[PDB]
Amino acid sequence: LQIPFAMQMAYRFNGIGVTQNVLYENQKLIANQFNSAIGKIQDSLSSTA
């Protein structure tokens, strides 16, 4: 069942015990943090063997 990804992340925030408004008001920051974390995963894999 399709759902907008921001809405899914709000569902997951509810799952961990945080209200949806936190995600909907910090969406830009959360997306930037996730993207930076994925980039750091890239760097860690491409450097550490």
């Binding site: 907008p4 921001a6 809405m7 569902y11 209200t19 949806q20 408004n21 909907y24 008001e25 969406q27």
Partner: protein, 60 residues
């Protein structure tokens, strides 16, 4: 939404539980307020019915 998700059939808006389509009128009881309109990406305009107002309207 307190619990559930906002949906629209095309003209009107409702709040329903996520796992079963049971549309309901968006009221103050079904929802909670947080902040203003300028910070949420994808917010839409719609009236939020106040269950208390018609009771006081008959009072008036």
């Amino acid at each position: 939404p307190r619990e559930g998700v906002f949906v629209s059939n095309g003209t009107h808006w409702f709040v329903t539980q996520r796992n079963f389509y049971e549309p309901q009128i968006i009221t103050t009881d079904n929802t909670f307020v947080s902040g203003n309109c300028d910070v949420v990406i994808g917010i839409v305009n719609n009236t939020v019915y106040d269950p208390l107002q018609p009771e006081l309207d008959s009072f008036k």
